[model samples]
Target: SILSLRYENNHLIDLSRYASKINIGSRVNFDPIDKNQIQLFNLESSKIEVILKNAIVYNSMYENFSTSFWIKIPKYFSEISLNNEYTIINCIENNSGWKVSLNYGEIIWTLQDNKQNIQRVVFKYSQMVAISDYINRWIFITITNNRLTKSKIYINGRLIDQKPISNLGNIHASNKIMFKLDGCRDPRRYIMIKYFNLFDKELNEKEIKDLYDSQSNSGILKDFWGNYLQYDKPYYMLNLFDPNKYVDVNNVGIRGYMYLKGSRSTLLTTNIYLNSGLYMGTKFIIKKYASGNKDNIVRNNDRVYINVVVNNKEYRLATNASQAGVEKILSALEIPDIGNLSQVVVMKSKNDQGIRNKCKMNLQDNNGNDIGFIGFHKFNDIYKLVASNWYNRQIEISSRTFGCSWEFIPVDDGWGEKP
Candidate 1:
């Protein structure tokens, strides 16, 4: 109750608490007054000469009686249309109860309530109803955007309902709006409320239901859909030769790193597994070591031998009778001097029966030594080195230079599987 009242008889009631005794040196026993006049008494005072802040006086029909207190309310409002609607607070009940109503400039807006003390706020755009529930003294709202339209609502940290209720109406003035609350008719009397939010667009129905049942604190608020309205991340790949390159396994380049061995005839088989996408050919510069020894002889017979199996079909290169003599020289022969061999094409040989085709060449040296320096380019030019699958798809090449040889290197190094 907002207001309170009380009454008194003409007889002196105990006034010691509120009155001063003029006849005696002690405090007054009661308030002295005539039959027609009403005297206000403070229930808290006993033979005291002071007034109480909370004390009030009134006149009853026969005698003076105090009245019970009640909240003061000017009016009550519940529903409004597509316009502005304020939550009408009935302060008469100690500023406690509230109702919602909508208002649309001059047009009619619809407001709905189950009249259940409004523990939560809920809505329905089309086929879905958004619900907001109060838990632990906090209000939570959610929506159900059933028809796959836009509609969204939130309560507390949880989303209650999201349904594309009405996509109609110009909504020029009402289109981009916010939820508002009013404490009392006067703006100065407005109550303080918290936990405000806004979504870029409306939500769907199923999303609403999920939010409603979410138990943990880590709900939609913890995810992107709750807080962020627009996403901002780049997603695309540029041309192969472009200086600014994007490196996703799905876009370009070999998956793993390449390693080169400076002093050995061994071909690292790592590329066989690390190669991705269409296994395109590799382009690198190669040169024959002019040094005395010539053990690294690449010939149409056995230049740089590769055991290739593409799409289940086995093939050989620089080997068998497939290569003409000149081609064999180009594929396997090391230049006499330290000159770079730019583009050398090696032919793939058809496998015959179970016998492996071997490219024959001289790995022996001039003075009867079985070693010579051979060289080839290691890295490929952007456009030239493409994934091998469609046209001109070729097998990986294993070549050597007088000083070094390249091989595939896996991610983890130092763990020593020697790439």
Candidate 2:
């Protein structure tokens, strides 16, 4: 059968339309916590030469093949200290097939067309730099067999080994050809396989990397594992009080925009969610309305409210709590006031320190046009503190003036490029 099992949401990728179909015993053992994962093997008391009998069978005779998957080997398994042979996958027709096996911590690929066309590429497991790379961590693996060009083995989207092999025969694969997980001979442990992609032809390096990147980005395959923050997930959070403060960003500039809001409120509200359709980036922008505006007019006992929508959730950021007075943080910072609260406003700042606002001027991005503003609230002298973790991260957009403070409690947001 021609199929690709992508378990991110426990869905199957349809490769049947891309290649010719062949019969193979296809039975799968999904795990209990089968969230984006397929569990392989159980505690087997009996030891057989064929590591797994009916787990996976490749009865098809093919010339070229490729298989890629994300696997997390259990910590209970170990490389044999003495003599041991671990068969990763095996296929043969009169000693003229292919087998991926391990010996002395070495991954060996044996491809046979006939005796003369036999080719092998031995990849040292020791070359992995760290043994922990495979155990207890989800690792991307791809084996591409193309006799037209060369056979390749990729670990974690990086090519580990490749060899020129020509004249690959139509070898009928089944051990009776078994391509199985936990295929080690004596002691085989369970493995968590997230996604499995089988291709009739060799996948180029870019194709392999694309698969790795996409699968790694899926939330299910995360172990702080090779792929993180690629699929729009937030990984860091910083509390910048003044637009003049310096910050370091090593990635492609900002992907989203931010802006501050000003409104009327008597209570010092922090994080408020509004199901507004406006889109904002992962970071929240806090701004106040123009002083002369009608909404900005502080009545006998009323104050201003600033809020924006992020990922369909509105966030209200205001001055420091623990005070019964009107908010003075924006007033202290000299933040630009808006005449029209109906206009879409966004926040922009420059990392360049020698510029205006001490390197942190509040700017705007409205349609194709640009707007400018100024605001800086250096909280006492210790305002340089950064919110540490991305999860459970909280900060106070406070200023030293009038002891103004606004607690920024992040409740929830999403990751990945927006539509």
Candidate 3:
């Protein structure tokens, strides 16, 4: 279920494999480093637009729908007329459809029928907060409608506003769906968009959070069920980065540039800051100690601890035995410190074979050295050794005992400027 379009190397890669793709508008620039963001500049007499014929499906429409995207406002803001609104997404046929826009510095969602429009639902962070507080920062926006319940708006996975729906009509079935950055009007502003998604179902709170988390990690878009959305054929997704200016992943021999007239579009370079540290590596290890006088085995409730020194600071990471399996315990132990560790030592608590066959624990160094020892024949002992030198570091278990294998993962403070 890969998405039809993806941002890679600052260009939107066409994964749809469609033959007759629509060309991208000309006045759009993509970020060179951050593949997720594309910049749209303000220009007089020019608007960023993409036209698609028969792209959207409105047949047997469900009662619930959701749309999500990440947007960033430029540091320098432009003033817009009070009467004008910046269009974010519009799919209207005879003025009957859904639209999301920015009206007077406030986020607004509107649902229209043939003759009337629903009450304009506005979203705000607080009673006194202004849009300036959100400017220059990337935020995730989600607009959802469950026709039976209510319409809701979320910012960065937090519900900010909700409104009751009355006679919410079906989405307009249109042969042409247009995505416009700024409406055809004077005095436009600058903004960036990334990972735009439209889901046919209303996602719950956890699902929304998961979506935000996944995209924030690597700009990966997902549907309500967490499946990637594949591109459908016959939809044109245009990109201004390539010389050809059109994306045709399948090489189906479809070509034609859409109308592009406005401010000049060029590649804009900027630094992208990740919200959290990235994963450096993960490893799994398993060992079985030979029976000494008695069959000593590991039990699910046994406790295992890892001692590591990172940045001259010693930290003890512990993993308790679980009937759920060694994988779960290892996963719980896979924290950020492991990624930055310089050395590691494993110790296991004492277990009595008289009660049950306790599982044996054996630790190893990168050079195949047995650095682990059992103190007092059962007390926990630490064996310290240098970290592995492998590029893709990992350790695995090779034993006949059940639940004897485990994996380790480490996290870094950050990717260090670039990922």
Candidate 4:
């Protein structure tokens, strides 16, 4: 599973709902003035910092791991020393594990063996370009080490550097892990982090590209429900969005908090402005109106009925002319365009035994391309359809298309009659 973290307002959120928690240090001022990101600034020894407990840093699953995250350096401080490295994510285990930092004029990664020696890899820009080329911009970075394969580093999904190592040994485990936006010793002036993720398994090029694309486009962590299924078990996935002070998502039951050490005026702000869309829950509602034939000679129930077929199983929506009927249909069906349809499908299908036991169908166009999906759940003997399209547009299933004989099947023991 992927361990993910997001920053909103001033607090770090664990999006995956995982066990590893963060401790925010004092002097970490969040959302300064008109800034949309959080900030850490202080010259005191008790500077602004974030601390991760041993359970998170020393997990055995991260033996062969990948780290993906984004950071924005808002300004250049002449005081930044080239002699002393500035730490990004530091895990000092027997002087091992991995440390991402900046030295000279490049982004550097140092991998250490159990014997306490270092193998360094560096990513530097062309000599023609100035430091301003990278400052004040959102930079995406991913570092992967499979132990068996080669260790690789990616910047913005592009492979910028790699190193070949054999039997490098496991990343040394530690009890205290720190992510220092400012330098651990030679602090920088301004730094901001948007998101961070750690994957136990090495991600392939395509997965890396897709992740960069999704996060860059949305500016938020992607849903991990698919990863949970793909891995065949629960993995650590974190999204930091809850309004609480502690980390709220994960299997480990760990919590996080913000700490202040220096000035009393420095505060950890929550609910800072982010450049991403809000996460609305999965439930959706749609209403459609069908006007009867204008030249009808007599009274007619011109309401539309919908039928859906998936994997040789068929489901139908009850014919109705009222808004309540529309609502019922909307309630039962899972719309794919909404958030995490797989989760909805999993939850709803389990409640009704399985998808095969539900009255639902996949929508396909004439060319056999997927259009949308529709399903119905039973309320006593009545059934209503909740319909949605691929684009999540307003749905209008007319009698002209759906007026046909539908083969309905009984849903388990409680559903007695066909609507």
Summed over model 1, clashes come to: 81
Tens-digit per-residue lDDT, 1-419, candidate 2: 24454433433333444322222233445543344465545333221123223324443334567877776543332334224555555566576766766554355677776453677776554322211345344577788886567888888789898888765554445443344544355344444566655666678888887787666443222212222111122222222333222222112212212323222112111221111111223343333433554332112111223333344443432222122322112211112432322222222211122111111122222231222222322344323221111111121232112211111222211111122
Each candidate: what lDDT? 0.22, 0.40, 0.41, 0.41
RMSD of 4: 21.3
Instruction: Kindly provide the TM-score of model 2 when superposed on the true structure, using C-alpha atoms.
Output: 0.44
Q: Provide the lowest-lDDT 10-residue window in model 4.
A: 225-234
Instruction: Give the residue spans of candidate 2 off by over 4 A.
Output: 6-29, 42-63, 75-83, 114-117, 127-131, 167-170, 175-188, 219-221, 224-419
The TM-score obtained by model 1 is 0.17
| lDDT string, candidate 4, 1-419, tens digits | 44566665555655554545667666655543223244545344322233443445643423677788766553332334435567766766667677778654467877777776566767774322211234345568888876765788888789988887554665665555466644545444445555577777788999898887666533111112110011011112111212111111111101211111111111111221111111111111111124543431111111222322222322222211122333223321222322322112211111121111111233333333333344323344333233334212332332122211111111211111121
When summed lDDT is taken over every stretch of 10 residues in candidate 2, the lowest stretch is 386-395
Give the alpha carbon lDDT tens digit for every residue of 1-419 in model 3.
Answer: 11234565434544443312334467766655345566666553223333332444443224577778887653322233345677766666676777777644467887765565564577743212211225345678888778777788888889988887756655563444344555624344666777876666788999998887666533222111112211111112111121122111111111211121222222212221212111211111222223342322223322234322333332333222221321211112224434422112332322222221122234343343433321111112311111121201222232122222221212111112121
TM-score of each: 0.17, 0.44, 0.46, 0.46
lDDT of 1 by residue, 153-228 (tens): 4443344443342322211111111112322232321111122112222344454434334421221111111110
TM-score: the better of candidates 1 and 3: 3
In angstroms, the error of model 3 at 236 is 42
For every candidate, C-alpha RMSD to the true structure in Å: 33.8, 16.8, 19.9, 21.3
**Model 4 TM-score, all chains together:** 0.46
